[model samples]
Target chain A: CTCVPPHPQTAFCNSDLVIRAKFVGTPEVNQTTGYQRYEIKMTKMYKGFQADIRFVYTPAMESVCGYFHRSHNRSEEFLIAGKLQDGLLHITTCSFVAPWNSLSLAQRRGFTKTYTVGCEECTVFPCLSIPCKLQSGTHCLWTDQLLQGSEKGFQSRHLACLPREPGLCTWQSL
Target chain B: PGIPKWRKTHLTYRIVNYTPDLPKDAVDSAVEKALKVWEEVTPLTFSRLYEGEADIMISFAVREHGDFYPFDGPGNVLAHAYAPGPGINGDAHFDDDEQWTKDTTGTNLFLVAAHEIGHSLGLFHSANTEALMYPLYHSLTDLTRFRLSQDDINGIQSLYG
Candidate 1:
């Protein structure tokens, strides 16, 4: 697909459900509607509200941008984000789905608490082109270099975009 | 759709609508070339069908065309497709808001179609930045010499090979 993947902050803000969970095994295929019902064990519920909430759904088709974590081990956890629809959680490749350990410290920290606290206070705009900067105190400029592994930018490696106060958000080492 | 890879070697496609940004013939050939990108590498073959439903249906549409996943206007999402399966599974849709073009100046139809077709063939996004299956779009040129990255090849070959 010819599209840009959103920043972690954006996904966190947009997702009605976000969590750290373990993929139990193979997904149950919906033969009629064509969706994969995944089995998950919630390790931490960072966002949203629900019951045992043990199931998540993605399109059974990858061309439709369904996401499969590529891991079946019950011990492996993933930082997953999604939208809640009709009492069910649905995620796509566009949703922020990543292996828990694969996340940078800043990203993990942001999703855990900092983001939940500040996401509404500001916006994270991706710097797809250079000469990028914060549009205002309530905005944070996200650069790709932060995830460019090895010698990564300090801000990208250890900082989270946080609220200094209402109407003010910026990167903080917290 | 959960069947993983297409079980058959020969697949069919039909372009439902054409974008006004380019000539109809340009769109047709662009799609033809895009399908060829996969045909060259895998044992799969794509036959174009005009009269009826096919394995992969192609189209160019704007916001909230018909499906649940709508286009995000101009830039955010250029297009999306479903993985290998029956019905809407392998179909491809393009955001007409994008300046569909035949060359490097605008969003090249061939390039985007090729990437989306990879998904229709059951390939998912690759971690490889240079791979056509990468989530982010790259504005590379020259379809005549365009090739899939080894990462892309391995992923698709693992399924269709």
Candidate 2:
């Protein structure tokens, strides 16, 4: 909660692994390593290579950017995107995490295909201001427009910045 | 991680110290007001303790006091807290490197304290921008008449209701 969250695609592209998983069993705490561990049961892998994953790691303390997973929402699938740290998929409160059902159809498509294709093809740069610095042709500007609404409501919902025949990035509907 | 919740209605918090930016009594009152924000919305109640480890502990520190997440000077992070549990959990720490104030001119102690206290309870960051538990810090107006957003009410009530 202390940091500025990156854009959705930015999170997806920055991630080493992304998956649809449910919190399965009781979590364990290691104050020594400072990790609060959650046992994982993966339903699908959106990104990352195959390997046996046992748990998702977060800091034991929230102030240290720890995550608070809804263990009671165990049945609901969570779309977690994580960074690989010390052989574990570490999640912080800043990481991308939300229930699968909460995503819109466009978002689901973005995760499944559009985003992957888009990331491979072009760059999606978030513009934090109105008169933001201009970018070159191969980079599409992404913005929430303003802080007045959901960050998920704009280009993140229905658009993908993809490359055209000229190899330039532009926004288009997913 | 294992999400934690307060098992009882009455919780006690102790202030380990006060910041230099406000009057001693002002810091005392501000902490009290922030605690009440969550208490009024649920069955939970709070008491302030002068000493001894209580249910929640409040303190102020600069870079690397005791935790791995060190404070980054004046601008970056204002404060942080843990979700409910024992020991270090449920405690709130403010960055003394920043100017902690009672009003809008500086980082509002009352506002940041309320947000951190939300973490001190079991609440996480709500995606709703209007919610009290939203991740970003924006200057809010009208503290005397402030109220909790519906998202906050729904989240806390789900745990304590």
Candidate 3:
């Protein structure tokens, strides 16, 4: 399928690829921490794929998690996708305070990982007839050097498309 | 609709190269329009700058552009961005490899931009289908047809507060 034009408020607003990836696993509450910890397990293997998880939480946790991929080419850039579930993670306002701002920044970009399986129900996997290509005016990144071992960015590779509403956008090319 | 608040930090961006599939002017206009939606709602401001420089770097990059977060080849990932910060922080990146569209025929730039902008403002995806912040992308009429849901407003406000 060829890349079609979106109506208005689509995740593919200005790009071709429309994708969504998630780490599926059972959820368990940590007794000591009194918080819900999703023990995500990898079911299938896309082969040569790497997956990373960003952990987010309130400052009350104190040192939620260390920010990953620090020595990036960009100074303050983060190599992580936003959460798929609301309230699951967030960067609360209250950054005026030193602790709040510091933790706010850290947890906001940090992610946790589970034993992710292979590409099963993923839309971008199994290599389709139309391997999406580079489009203009859209947000995209490559890991030819870094993500080689990880299924050529298949694993650890993440993408999401959030369309605004019905009729506003239509994903064609099927 | 109440404005979704975010701590204002100067944002600078640029379109590195135009995608052959999309019209550069049309793409830029869509991006501008998308960013404007957030700017109008909040006090935050943004500026366009050249490559190799800028706080919130807005550029069109391709798969595995270094770092751990490698983008899926084409159709899987529409685009992604970072939260507000210093240095490489607050930068927003779009997947130029994807065939981005203006209307509903393909993936909508406005919709993705709005979602990515949510991340740029330090917000995450919501489980609520009715919420714009929801994780799964939906093409429902009432759900995403109009404005932000109460849940979305509350979530954005929570971060802005």
TM-score (C-alpha) between model 2 and the true structure = 0.58
Worst ten in a row by lDDT for model 3 chain B: B135-144
- Native contacts recovered by model 3: 0.00
Highest-scoring model, TM-score: 1
Top candidate, metric DockQ: 1
True contacts kept of 1: 0.61
In model 2, which regions exceed 4 Å deviation? Answer: A127-129, A135-138, A145-148, A165-167, B1-128, B136-161
What residue pairs clash in candidate 1, if any at all?
A63-B81, A63-B82, A63-B83, A64-B81, A64-B82
lDDT, candidate 1, A12-111, per-residue tens: 8888898899888788988665578898889998888654588889877555666766776758789888878788888876667878887787778878
Assess each model's interface with DockQ, reporting 2 decimals per model.
Answer: 0.40, 0.16, 0.02
Worst 10 residues of 3 chain A by lDDT: A91-100
Model 1 misplaced regions, further than 4 Å: A1-3, A50-52, A127-139, A145-157, A162-172, B1-14, B18-33, B39-56, B62-78, B82-90, B95-109, B121-127, B135-146, B151-161
lDDT of 1 at A9: 72
True contacts kept of each: 0.61, 0.24, 0.00
Compute the TM-score of each model's chain A versus the native chain A and list the values. Answer: 0.81, 0.87, 0.18
Per-residue lDDT tens digits of candidate 3, residues B23-113? 7777788678666665655556678875577655655668766432344456544565665666545555666677666654445566666
After aligning candidate 3 to the native by TM-score, how far in Å is the CA of A17 from where it should be? Answer: 24
Question: Considering TM-score, which of the candidate structures 1 and 3 is the better prediction for this target?
Answer: 1
Candidate 3 per-residue C-alpha lDDT over A59-166 given as tens digits, one digit per residue, 9 for 90 to 100: 221111111121322222221222233434321111110111222222222122211111111112111112334342221223221224122232222322212243
